Amino acid sequence: MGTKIIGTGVYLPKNVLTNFDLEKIVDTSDEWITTRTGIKERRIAKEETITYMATQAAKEALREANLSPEELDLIILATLTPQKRFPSTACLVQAQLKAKGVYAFDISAACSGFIYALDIADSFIKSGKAKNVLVIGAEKLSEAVDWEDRSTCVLFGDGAGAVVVTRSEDKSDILATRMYAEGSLEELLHADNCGYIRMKGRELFKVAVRSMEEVCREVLEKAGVKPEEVSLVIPHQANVRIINALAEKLNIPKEKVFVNIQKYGNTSAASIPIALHEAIKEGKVKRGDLILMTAMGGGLTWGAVLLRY
Template identity: 50%
Template sequence: MKKARIIGTGSYVPEKVLTNFDLEKTLDTTDEWIVARTGIHERHVAAEGEFTSDLATNAARKALEMAGVAAEEIDLIVVGTITGDFPWPATACLVQSNLGIKGCAAFDVSAACSGFLYALDAATKQIQSGAVKKALVIGAEVLTRAIDWQDRNTCVLFGDGAGAVVLEAQEGDQGVLSTHLHADGSYWELLYQPGFGSRFPASAEGLAERLPFLKMQGNEVFKVAVRSLHEVAVEALEANGLVASDIDLFIPHQANRRILEATAKRLGLRDEQVYINVDRFGNTSGASIPIALDEANRLGRIKAGDMLLFDAFGGGFTWAAAMVRW
């Protein structure tokens, strides 16, 4: 059975940078408070007229360029997002149109911050089945339009961006070795966006109650996130007969620095094994892992044969991991 090998990476973040000092001007908060609790110094914010599909398309083009693959060679597009341009059609279809492709399958995956790994799993399975030869997998979010800028506990956390990979069916031992997906819907009220869906359809009353904006019980999310991230990472290691010291680079979902450090400590990873860029991008949800992967790749932090471990946790609750031999 052929493996799904990552042959190109790409990422894109909006030009506008919003620093903690900028937030001090409109919120009862300080740079010191934000950094101490999250490790975040700044985040990128989409410009007016810039949408999730735009970010995703830009990241995709960079990944295609690195891979040396023409857009028309792509057989499948999967986008992990919870902030698509529209409730429907899928953002993947808009990306397909932007790239000038017609006919290949294109769909979105809604798994919050685990979205990229859920999308990676879907595309990998299609390649392993023989149905697809080349796939484009994207994580993209414009979360700054889904957060309450009056809530200092949540709005300081999130940023916008997109990351993408090109997968190709190849023989050999390089590629996605395993993916591990989990969910527990009983936790849904700890992290969700109430409106506007079928439960709370669009209304003036709902807008006044700020239903379109993300709601989170941060302390409870933290506890479950650290436990789940650790457990699924161990599951991925054991499935491949590996231990923590075998990992060349651990690329977790960039939620906040405290969660990343707690997870790495539980796994027994050294600082040099862990890639962290949450300080510069904030939490970009489903985009965070592919953005970090592309950055690490372009900085030369990854070489052929390296073992990479991806790890994510998000609303749902969902959590996932993937083991990749570069």
């Protein structure tokens, strides 16, 4: 029984960019950024390409799963910064991993990319169409950031996260998932004619808390799980204040809410998978634990996934 996570990995760019470094780039400050978001630093893929980052996170994940690339049945990569029009970055990565002939493609869902991709993987496993699936969330957001706009350039970072899921016969499994989208709210968060990230910060914040709360409550009810029974909440890392307001609305103690936005900023699709990896490595996740993942992103995509590790 169950879609089970048997391996996780990540790749964090070599270049660190603190708020102090940014102060010299745009009219901003450490105090402002820190208090309004909780971000202290962010990684920048100045040297690495999206493909390279995704491949590294995937390799570590496969090593952890003790699974050969060829044993994969599917590779799903979520990103909003593809290497090229085509082939998909999933294909470029597959090539680097030597996962010959392996089914591969990218998906677009912005910040909701990983949970969308994980939900897809679960559909393939639950339909008996796949057994081993590699799900990657990789982003080189720095290429989509307007570095002259102190309003948005201080929120994003680069990096990649990956997880390997398989069909197990034990109790590990995804208990419930729920994804939503609302294209009529494109304006709140979207790319312009040149691909630059644009947003309506205030409106977005409201919608973010309300929407993630709603879908989180939905998966909990569907799974017949109460908030107090959640072992750990791994939310998209967009703003520490949003995360706090969300935890409050769900009545989940801060101690059970994983946060690492302070060191990576908002990495979109790679956000949750990177947090999951560190959470595991920090001894905060053990088999049997109920993990709640949730996110909201451009296009106004959002959802939640409740699983028993």
